[PDB]
Design a protein around this ligand. Sequence first.
Ligand SMILES: [K+]
Ligand SMILES: [Zn+2]
Lengths: 34, 76
Amino acid sequence: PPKQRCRAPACDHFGNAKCNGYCNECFQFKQMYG
Amino acid sequence: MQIFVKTLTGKTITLEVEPSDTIENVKAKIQDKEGIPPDQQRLIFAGKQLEDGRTLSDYNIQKESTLHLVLRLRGG
Ligand SMILES: [K+]
Ligand SMILES: [Zn+2]
């Protein structure tokens, strides 16, 4: 599987498992600034 | 006056600010602390997206209020 919002605060994208629950976009940013 | 900005990693950023500080100012402060270009920053308070040319006070952001920071790429 069922759908889930990105775990990033106030992000309304859908998360995925390959990105640990983040959307792809936040996961990219996270790889940069996290 | 301090406010808090919560990032995608759950990290809390503490900013020294004034009620008359603009959103653009707050994003410039975030760029200083974190290195994130302001055009990639989206600030959210009370679930509402904040406009660059407006003050914290315009959004009733108070001492030790907490904002949420969402990051988005820009393609033009
Ligand atoms: K979310
Ligand atoms: Zn996201």
